[PDB]
Amino acid sequence: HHWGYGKHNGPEHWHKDFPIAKGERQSPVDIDTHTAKYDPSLKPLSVSYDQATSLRILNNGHAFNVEFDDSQDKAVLKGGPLDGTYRLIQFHFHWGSLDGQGSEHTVDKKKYAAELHLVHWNTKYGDFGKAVQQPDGLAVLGIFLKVGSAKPGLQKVVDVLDSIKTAGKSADFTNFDPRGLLPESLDYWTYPGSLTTPPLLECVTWIVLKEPISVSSEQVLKFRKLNFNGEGEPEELMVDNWRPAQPLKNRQIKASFK
Ligand code: NA
Ligand SMILES: [Zn+2]
C-alpha cells in the first residue's frame, strides 16, 4: 500500500487519501485517568476464548496479524459496553524502535513499549466487511505491553517471526491459545473510536485494559527484526508502526472501575 509510517507517507499524510483521518471519532487517544467517568452500569467483560482456532500468521507490510477461524462462535467477546456477540478475527501489535514508545493509546501521556489489539466483529452483520461499515461493527480489546519479565504465552508468536520477515509472507499457525496474552484483571476504559490504520473507519468500540502485560526485552527485540518491505526490496525495519494520539473532541471515556 502507499501509506505507511515514514517521513513522506506516515500518519500526518493519511488525510489526503483518507479524509476521515480528521473525523470526529478517531483513534487512538490519550486516556486521562482523572477525567474518565466511572460508570457503574458497565458490566464485566466476558471473554470466551477456550474454543479459539488460530489459522495463520501474516506479515501484511504494516504489522503481523494472527488470524482465526471466524466462521462460527468459537472465540467471542460479550458484555462490557457491548450489545451482542463479537467474534475474534485477528490480533496484531504496534511497537516502537525503543522501549519508551510503541503503544497507540497513552494513559496520562504515558507511552508503553507496545500495544496488542484483539479485533472482533459484531455477528449481527454477518461478515467483517459489512461490520466495518456500522458504528457498532467492531470491538477491539487493547492491551499494553511493558518490558520486564518474559510472557511465556507469547513465545510461540515470537519464534515464528523469522518465517514471515518480509511483507506478503505467511505461515501456518495452528493451536495458538490467545488466553495466554490476557492480564489477570479485566478492568477497562471504553470509548467510541476508529480503526487506527487506513481506512480509519469509525466503527470501533474500544475496550482498553488497565493492567499491562509484561514481556521481555528479548521478546520485543524480535518484533523489531521484521521488515515493512517485500523480499528482495531494500530493507526497512518494521518499527514505530503506531499512530499518535488524536483529539478526543466530543467524547467521554468511561471506566469500569474506580
Ligand atoms: Na489489517
Ligand atoms: Zn492495531
Curated annotation (Swiss-Prot):
EC numbers on record: 4.2.1.1, 4.2.1.69
Effect upon mutating E115Q: Strongly reduced activity and sulfonamide affinity
Localisation: Cytoplasm; Cell membrane
Effect listed in the UniProt record for changing V140 to F/Y: Strongly impaired activity
Database matches in InterPro entries: CA_dom, CA_dom_sf, Carbonic_anhydrase_a-class, Carbonic_anhydrase_a-class_CS
Organism: Homo sapiens
GO CC list: apical part of cell; cytoplasm; cytosol; extracellular exosome; myelin sheath; plasma membrane
PANTHER family (UniProt xref): CARBONIC ANHYDRASE, CARBONIC ANHYDRASE 2
Catalytic activity: hydrogencarbonate + H(+) = CO2 + H2O; urea = cyanamide + H2O
A molecular function (GO) term: arylesterase activity
Superkingdom assignment: Eukaryota
Consequence recorded when altering V119 to K/R: Strongly reduced CO(2) hydrase and p-nitrophenyl acetate esterase activities
Enzyme class of the recorded protein, top EC level: lyase
Biophysicochemical property: pH dependence: Optimum pH is 6-8.
Site (Involved in the binding of some activators, including histamine and L-histidine): Q90
Alphabetically ordered keywords of this record: Acetylation, Cell membrane, Cytoplasm, Disease variant, Lyase, Membrane, Metal-binding, Osteopetrosis, Phosphoprotein, Zinc
Modification sites for Phosphoserine: S163, S170
Result when mutating N60T: Reduced activity
Name recorded for this polypeptide: Carbonic anhydrase 2
Keyword Hydrolase applies: no
Effect of substituting N60D: Strongly reduced activity
Broad class of where this protein is predominantly found: cytoplasm
Result after altering G142R: In OPTB3; complete loss of activity
Family annotation (PROSITE patterns): ALPHA_CA_1 (PS00162), ALPHA_CA_2 (PS51144)
Record's cofactor remark: Zinc. Can also use cobalt(II) with lower efficiency, but not copper(II), nickel(II) and manganese(II).
Annotated phenotype, changing N65H: Enhanced proton transfer
